Amino acid sequence: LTEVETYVLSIIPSGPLKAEIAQRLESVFAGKNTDLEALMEWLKTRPILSPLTKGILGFVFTLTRRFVQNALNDPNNMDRAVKLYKKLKREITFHGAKEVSLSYSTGALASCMGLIYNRMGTVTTEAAFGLVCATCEQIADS
C-alpha cells in the first residue's frame, strides 16, 4: 500500500485531483472510508483521467463495475495476460510479482488486471499489488 501509492499517484496528471485521490486511497487503506459505492461512483465520474487510469484506480480501490472491466480490456495482449496470470498465481510476495510483471507490456498488464478483476481470489493480494505497481511504473515511464 505505502509502496503502491507513490507509483499510483505518478500516473495521475497534476492538479487538485491527485490530492483528492491520495486522500481517498489513504482513508480507504486505513479503513476510515468504507463506502466503496460512493467511492466507485466518485471515480467513475472523474474528468481528466484516461479510461485506463480509472480502471487501474478502480482495481486498486477494489483491492484495498463495467467502466473498470472495459477500461482494463488485443488478442496478443490477452494471450500474454494469461501467461502472466499463470505466473502470478504462483507469486506469494509483492516484489516477486512486481519483478515478473515488469517483463510484460502495458497492454498485457492491463488485460491481466482485467482477468483478476473478474476472478478475485485467484491471486493473493500481495501479488495483485505487485502487478498494479508494475503497470503504473511502465505507464509513468512513457
Helical ranges in 73-124 per DSSP H: 75-88, 94-101, 106-117
- Deposited experimental method: X-ray
Query: Structure resolution in Å?
Result: 2.2
**Same domain, yes or no: 95 and 82:** yes
Instruction: With beta carbons less than 8 A apart as the criterion, state whether 131 and 101 touch.
Output: yes
Grid cell for residue 80? 500474454
φ/ψ of 35, rounded to 5, equals -90, 80
For residue 132, what are the CA distances in angstroms to 15, 32, 124, 137? 22, 22, 13, 8
State how far the Cα of 133 lies from the Cα of 24, in Å rounded to an integer.
18
Nearest CA to 80 out of 116, 45, 47, 108 is that of 108
Question: Which cell goes with 138?
Answer: 511502465
Q: What is the CA 27 to chain-centroid distance, rounded?
A: 17
Residues 140 and 77 in one domain: yes
Give residue 90's domain range: 68-142
Q: How far apart are CA 131 and CA 99, in angstroms?
A: 9
Q: Supply the CATH number for residue 93's domain.
A: 1.10.10.180
Cα 30 from chain centroid (whole Å): 18
Quick one: 57 and 107 in the same domain?
no
